[PDB]
Amino acid sequence: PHRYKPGTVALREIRRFQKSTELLIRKLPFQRLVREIAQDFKTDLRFQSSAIGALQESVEAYLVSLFEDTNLAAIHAKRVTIQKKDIKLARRLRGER
Amino acid sequence: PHRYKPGTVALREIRRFQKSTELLIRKLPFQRLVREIAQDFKTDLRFQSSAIGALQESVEAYLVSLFEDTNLAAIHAKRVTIQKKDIKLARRLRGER
Amino acid sequence: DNIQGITKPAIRRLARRGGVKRISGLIYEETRGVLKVFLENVIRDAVTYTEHAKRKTVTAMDVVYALKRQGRTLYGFGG
Amino acid sequence: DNIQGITKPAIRRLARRGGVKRISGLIYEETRGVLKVFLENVIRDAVTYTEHAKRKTVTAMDVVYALKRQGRTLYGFGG
Amino acid sequence: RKETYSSYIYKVLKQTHPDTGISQKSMSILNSFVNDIFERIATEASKLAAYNKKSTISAREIQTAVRLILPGELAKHAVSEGTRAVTKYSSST
Amino acid sequence: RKETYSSYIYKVLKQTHPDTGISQKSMSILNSFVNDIFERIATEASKLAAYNKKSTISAREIQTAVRLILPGELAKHAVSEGTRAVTKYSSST
Amino acid sequence: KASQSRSAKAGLTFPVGRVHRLLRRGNYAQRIGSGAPVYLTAVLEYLAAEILELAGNAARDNKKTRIIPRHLQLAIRNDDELNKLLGNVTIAQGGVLPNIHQNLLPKK
Amino acid sequence: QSRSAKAGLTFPVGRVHRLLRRGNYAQRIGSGAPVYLTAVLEYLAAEILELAGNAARDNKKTRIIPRHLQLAIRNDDELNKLLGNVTIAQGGVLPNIHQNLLPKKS
DNA sequence: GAGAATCCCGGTGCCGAGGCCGCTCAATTGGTCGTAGACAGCTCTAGCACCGCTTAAACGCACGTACGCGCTGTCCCCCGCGTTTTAACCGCCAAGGGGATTACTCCCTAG
DNA sequence: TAGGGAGTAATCCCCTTGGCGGTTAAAACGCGGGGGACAGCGCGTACGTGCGTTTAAGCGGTGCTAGAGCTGTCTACGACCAATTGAGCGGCCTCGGCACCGGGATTCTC
């Protein structure tokens, strides 16, 4: 059969994901995560679905901006594969410690 | 015939300026610079003496805060010498464009 | 299985939204770690706005005010 | 030639404050181009405060408020 | 009873694009945007009036706040539109 | 005829340290610190009062404010000492 | 005796009196002058008109007749003074502009 | 009788009440609220003065200098991120030397 | 093993950091009233819980190949140092231009 | 309808912009030398690809009840006003901590 070069259909997946505007995290594991993370500060806490959407949009923008910052720090380091020290450098030079 | 290794006296004077906290910028050339950069909008400008000292402290703090960041970018770049590309990545990661 | 409630291709989806090419395997738990240190700072401020208002449910208002605080503001839910 | 007011050993003094063993020679003019935009960005918000005060002199009182407006609030000269 | 700007901005869109529809979420973003802009401009003006030891807000402190906040060509177009509007309104004679 | 805070910080410093001297640049520094903390706390308290449809500022809103901005062990130290002062005032009414 | 509002006296479609109300009981100042709501209303007029212009051109650029938040996001992020003003705000359901680094392409 | 002495504090409750009421924050204002703000300002002032005093005695001086103030603010991490956006005057930077920049071996 | 280069101990004006009195506004006390915060009480939206079908998304094992990484040889461009030289800085004298402030007034903004 | 907040303006005094000049740390400039950055080449493995096999997300439907939210009523906290006393700003006065200078011990570096 006919195959593809590794890193060429990944460009197509990149342009598909950078066209598509849809949501990239499933709603029930995220709502379980935010409920068990809000249980620590205060019990018997109910939630709103609009608050769920606002929270998920905030964290989705946060990983997106942090992630091209990590990618730019990685190509800065004459490499293509990202590593954990790129994340630590991006966090340290972005200001949050 | 006593010749020092290059960088040892650099680190020693780095230590002396680490105990030091005085102004490292000459006063009158910086006064000339701020007058020639403030003349362009409304001429015949009177200046107070303390404003120039405040400008000195702010430019020195911004320079050292950028230089620690580009030192971190340089030591992350597996090098000892800095470059313009470290300075651009410092400005990109700190976010002043 | 709550902190790993997000799945392995979820960081991949957030990755390829970000224009990356090659991704390692040790970064997934580290991205989950920055999830933890981000959501603590978000929902501690959210629950301060919550029980200040004498309510035991979070609405759409206190979350966007919590987001308004640190300078990562978000539109769309301002009303 | 007045733009040549800032001198290269002063940039070296600022560099060794950062604790750097090796400095290349292009860093001086890079920092010159960096600083030139930077001080003009506070001269932008100082002289308009001065003009709205109906004053033709600047002081230590409006420059600290310009830095406090942009977001590097500085102590020592009041405010 | 709740307040929104929706009919005014709808009319602004019909002045330049008559055949264009609207998502309600787009009104939510743009209402938040105009409220946020009014927010920063108004507290910048109040802060500047508290600086000059004045108890009155007039057109000149919000003019200076517009010059402070907006970028330069938007600042000059905004003060042009504001000055022509306030001189048209001031001609009530 | 300006107002300073120098006598009170001098009294506090002599309460904690009976031998330390101080310079005037440091007094300007920490007067600016006190005014910055006061101003940030005050605009946050006014914001939380206007946000809860509330026309009076009472100690609950500054309690929520010093909960939300100040660091946590300083936050509960400040809450403890401020509540101690609150009961000291309400006892000695 | 009957006369209309100040908005058409200034020739504006945004409410001058509502802005005056919000400036009065928004506790920004103890005294509010007459010409301040007119100036602020005109500034909001021009800002909303320019944002609607860029949104309408973006919606024409996708061959649609409705304003999607994608159109608002691309109109804000494409243009650079709107990039500087709105850099710190994340648009709800906006997405990310397409960009690839030159070294990441299959250069060969 | 002074309200500061009634509340057991050494800070001018009347002055901060004046600054709060003629500062245009709310139409009405509380009575125990300036006392509460007075107490928390006294606490932060006392704690930063204690830290500056310790940073004075460890470097043999009986005088407070802004370098000692920088030494007092930067070591405490919670105070450091409290003032992560604040530039001090005549304070300097802490001495940190990178391990890769440190030469030789052992 | 030597040698710059530090750290450490002792004498010196000094000039800038603690008291002190004078006193002038600004914190304190008392009375009045009209409204706003608190509590009680009320109606329904909306949030939680669970059952069950569908299935597309996710885990896991297998392998193959670019890409991270270790080593290497090399220009060469930064680093220590001697020599001019050039502008920065300190002491100072004089001007006059610009900020502070007093003082009445009227208009326009609060109600 | 009212009243008090800018507005005008004049006057005093203070600081700051030029202009002196010496002298002196300090920058400019040229020169020897040494590790550091540069590309290049090989070794292996880790991430991409793929198919079989779950699984537990998603829809959607229903049932229940807390709790959001609006209204009514009350009364006591607080703005407002008039008199008062005291305390914190300031000019003035006085003296010792620290920088500065001089000279000897001491530690990395070569």
Whichever domain contains G12, its CATH number is 1.10.20.10
> What is the rounded CA–CA span in Å between residue C55 and residue A42?
11
> What is the rounded CA–CA span in Å between residue F59 and residue F42?
12
Phi, psi of B26 (to 5 degrees): -70, 140
Tokens at D23, concatenated:
């400095």
Residue D34 CA: distances (Å) to CA of D39, F82, H36: 9, 46, 45
Residue C76 corresponds to which amino acid? G
Tokens at G47, concatenated:
């800002």
B23 close to B56: Cβ distance less than 8 angstroms = yes
> What is the rounded CA–CA span in Å between residue H42 and residue H15?
14
Closest by alpha carbon to C2, among E53, A79, D76, A39?
A: A39
Query: Which candidate from D72, D76, D77 shows the least CB-CB separation from H85?
Result: D72
D42 close to B57: Cβ distance less than 8 angstroms = no
Chain B window 56-75: residues with CB closer than 7 Å to nucleic chain J are none
F28 touches strand J (CB under 7 A): no
H68 close to H58: Cβ distance less than 8 angstroms = no
Residue G30 CA: distances (Å) to CA of E48, E55, E61: 14, 6, 15
Closest by alpha carbon to B34, among C39, D63, G25?
A: D63
> What is the rounded CA–CA span in Å between residue B47 and residue B43?
12
Closest by alpha carbon to D31, among B54, H98, B86?
A: B86
CA H10 vs. chain centroid, Å, equals 16
Residue A44: Cβ-neighbour burial (10 angstroms; 0-12, 13-18, 19+): exposed
F56 close to F48: Cβ distance less than 8 angstroms = no
Report the domain count for chain H: 1
Tokens at A41, concatenated:
């500060």
G105 part of a folded domain: no
> What is the rounded CA–CA span in Å between residue C52 and residue F58?
13
Phi, psi of G67 (to 5 degrees): -90, 110
Phi, psi of C74 (to 5 degrees): -135, 135
Please give the residue of chain B at the shortest CA–CA distance from H91.
Answer: B21
In chain A, where does DSSP find H-type helix?
Answer: 9-19, 27-38, 49-76, 84-94
Residues 6+ apart with CB under 8 A from B74: B80, B81, B82, B83, B86, D20
Closest by alpha carbon to G36, among H73, A92, B23, G44?
A: G44
> What is the rounded CA–CA span in Å between residue H68 and residue B93?
31
CA dihedral E64→E66→E67→E70, nearest 10 degrees, is: 160
- Chains sharing 3 or more CB pairs under 8 A with chain D: B, E, F, H
What's the angle, vertex CA A76, arms to CA A75 and CA A81, rounded to 5? 35
H101 part of a folded domain: no
E54 touches strand J (CB under 7 A): yes
Q: Where do the structural domains in chain F lie, given as residue ranges?
A: 1-93
Closest nucleotide (C1' vs CA) to A31 is J57
> What is the rounded CA–CA span in Å between residue H94 and residue D75?
18
Sign of CA dihedral C24, C28, C29, C32: positive
Q: Which residue has the tokens 């007459």?
A: G34
Residue C15: Cβ-neighbour burial (10 angstroms; 0-12, 13-18, 19+): buried
B5 DSSP assignment: P
Chain G residues touching A77 at Cβ < 8 A: none
Shortest Cα–Cα distance, E65 to chain D (Å): 10
G46 part of a folded domain: yes
Class of CATH domain F1-93: mainly alpha
Phi, psi of D23 (to 5 degrees): -120, 125
H101 at interface of D, judged by CB pairs closer than 8 A = yes
H2 touches strand J (CB under 7 A): yes
CA–C1' span, C53 to I40, in Å? Answer: 19
Residue C66 corresponds to which amino acid? A
C22 touches strand J (CB under 7 A): yes
CA–C1' span, H28 to J79, in Å? Answer: 8
Tokens at F1, concatenated:
């005829």
Closest nucleotide (C1' vs CA) to D57 is I98
Residue H38: Cβ-neighbour burial (10 angstroms; 0-12, 13-18, 19+): buried
Sort strands E21-22 and B46-47 into parallel, antiparallel or unpaired.
unpaired
Residues 6+ apart with CB under 8 A from A34: A47, A52, A55, C39, C43
Chain B residues touching H98 at Cβ < 8 A: 71, 75
CATH code, residues B6-97: 1.10.20.10
H68 close to H52: Cβ distance less than 8 angstroms = yes
F6 touches strand J (CB under 7 A): yes
CA–C1' span, F10 to J99, in Å? Answer: 25
Residues 6+ apart with CB under 8 A from D25: none
> What is the rounded CA–CA span in Å between residue F82 and residue F59?
9
D24 close to B81: Cβ distance less than 8 angstroms = yes
Query: Which candidate from F3, F19, F74 shows the least CB-CB separation from H78?
Result: F74
D57 touches strand J (CB under 7 A): yes
Residues 6+ apart with CB under 8 A from A97: A91, H81
DSSP line for chain F: -----HHHHHHHHHHH-SS-EE-HHHHHHHHHHHHHHHHHHHHHHHHHHHHTT-SEE-HHHHHHHHHHTS-HHHHHHHHHHHHHHHHHHHHT-
In chain E, where does DSSP find H-type helix?
Answer: 6-16, 24-51, 59-69, 72-89
Residue A90 corresponds to which amino acid? A
CA–C1' span, H26 to J82, in Å? Answer: 25
b or e along E21-48 (b: 16 or more beta carbons within 10 Å of the residue's beta carbon)?
ebeebbbbbbbbbbebbbeebbebbbbb
Domain that holds residue H46: 1-86
B50 close to D77: Cβ distance less than 8 angstroms = yes
Kindly determine whether residue H26 and residue G27, on different chains, have CB atoms separated by under 8 Å.
yes
Query: Which candidate from B51, B81, B91 shows the least CB-CB separation from D24?
Result: B81
G103: how many CB neighbours lie within 10 A of its CB?
9
Query: Which candidate from H24, H26, H27 shows the least CB-CB separation from G29?
Result: H24
Please give the residue of chain H at the shortest CA–CA distance from D76.
Answer: H89
F5 touches strand J (CB under 7 A): yes
D4 close to B54: Cβ distance less than 8 angstroms = no
DSSP line for chain G: -----HHHHTT-SS-HHHHHHHHHTTTS-SEE-SSHHHHHHHHHHHHHHHHHHHHHHHHHTTT-SEE-HHHHHHHHHHSSHHHHHTSS-BPTT--------GGGS---
Beta pairing partners, D57: B46
Chain C residues touching E39 at Cβ < 8 A: none
Angle at which helix G36-60 crosses helix E72-89, to 10 degrees, equals 130
Residue H13 corresponds to which amino acid? V
Residues 6+ apart with CB under 8 A from A90: A66, A69, A70, A73, B93
Tokens at F40, concatenated:
């940030």
Cα-atom radius of gyration of chain C, to the nearest Å? Answer: 16
> What is the rounded CA–CA span in Å between residue F63 and residue F61?
5
Q: Which residue has the tokens 């003065």?
A: H49
> What is the rounded CA–CA span in Å between residue G98 and residue B71?
31
F87 at interface of D, judged by CB pairs closer than 8 A = no
Please give the residue of chain D at the shortest CA–CA distance from B17.
Answer: D17
Residue H1 corresponds to which amino acid? Q
Closest by alpha carbon to A58, among E40, G85, C51, C69?
A: C69
> What is the rounded CA–CA span in Å between residue H51 and residue H46?
9
F45 close to H20: Cβ distance less than 8 angstroms = no
CA–C1' span, C48 to J66, in Å? Answer: 21
G49 part of a folded domain: yes
Query: How many Cα atoms sit within 13 Å of H31 on the Cβ side?
Result: 6
Kindly determine whether residue E68 and residue D53, on different chains, have CB atoms separated by under 8 Å.
no
> What is the rounded CA–CA span in Å between residue B83 and residue B60?
20
> What is the rounded CA–CA span in Å between residue F60 and residue F66?
10
Sort strands H28-29 and F56-57 into parallel, antiparallel or unpaired.
parallel
F90 touches strand J (CB under 7 A): no
A70 close to A94: Cβ distance less than 8 angstroms = no
Shortest Cα–Cα distance, G98 to chain E (Å): 22
Residues 6+ apart with CB under 8 A from A49: none
> What is the rounded CA–CA span in Å between residue C20 and residue C23?
8
Closest by alpha carbon to H44, among H66, H68, H76, H21?
A: H76
E21 DSSP assignment: E
CA C31 vs. chain centroid, Å, equals 12
Closest by alpha carbon to E60, among C39, G36, G67, B80?
A: G36
Instruction: State which approach was used to obtain the coordinates.
Output: cryo-EM
D72 at interface of H, judged by CB pairs closer than 8 A = yes
**Which helix H or strand E contains D13, and what residues bound it?**
helix D8-18
CA E53 vs. chain centroid, Å, equals 25
What's the angle, vertex CA D43, arms to CA D13 and CA F32, rounded to 5? 75
In chain H, where does DSSP find H-type helix?
Answer: 3-7, 13-21, 32-57, 66-74, 77-82
> What is the rounded CA–CA span in Å between residue G57 and residue A16?
24
Residues 6+ apart with CB under 8 A from F3: H15
Q: Which residue has the tokens 């500060």?
A: A41
Q: Which residue has the tokens 């250069």?
A: G107
Kindly determine whether residue D77 and residue F35, on different chains, have CB atoms separated by under 8 Å.
no
A46 close to A31: Cβ distance less than 8 angstroms = no
C63 close to C46: Cβ distance less than 8 angstroms = yes
Shortest Cα–Cα distance, G4 to chain H (Å): 32
B58 close to D74: Cβ distance less than 8 angstroms = yes
**Which helix H or strand E contains B75, and what residues bound it?**
helix B49-76
> What is the rounded CA–CA span in Å between residue H6 and residue D69?
38
Indicate the SS3 state at residue E56: strand
Domains of chain D with bracketed CATH: 1-79 (1.10.20.10)
Length of chain H: 106
Cα-atom radius of gyration of chain H, to the nearest Å? Answer: 20
DSSP line for H52-79: HHHHHHTTT-SEE-HHHHHHHHHSSHHH
Closest by alpha carbon to E9, among G13, G68, G71, G72?
A: G13
Q: Which residue has the tokens 């000492």?
A: F81
Closest by alpha carbon to G35, among G11, G4, G3, G6?
A: G6
E10 close to E21: Cβ distance less than 8 angstroms = no
Phi, psi of G53 (to 5 degrees): -65, -45
Residues 6+ apart with CB under 8 A from A18: C16, C17, C19, G95, G96, G97, G98
Beta pairing partners, H87: D74
Closest by alpha carbon to F13, among H91, H73, H52, H39?
A: H52
Q: Which residue has the tokens 């500087």?
A: G84
C16 close to A14: Cβ distance less than 8 angstroms = yes
H92: how many CB neighbours lie within 10 A of its CB?
19
Chain B residues touching A69 at Cβ < 8 A: 92-93
Closest by alpha carbon to F54, among G27, C51, C62?
A: G27
Residue E48 CA: distances (Å) to CA of B27, E56, F70: 31, 11, 27
Q: Which residue has the tokens 């995560």?
A: A33
For strand I, the positions having any atom within 7 A of a protein Cβ are 3-6, 16-18, 26-29, 36-38, 46-48, 57-59, 64, 66-69, 77-81, 87-89, 98-99, 101, 108-110
Phi, psi of H64 (to 5 degrees): -85, 120
B80 DSSP assignment: S
Kindly determine whether residue B94 and residue A95, on different chains, have CB atoms separated by under 8 Å.
yes
Chain G residues touching A11 at Cβ < 8 A: 100, 106
Kindly determine whether residue F25 and residue D73, on different chains, have CB atoms separated by under 8 Å.
no
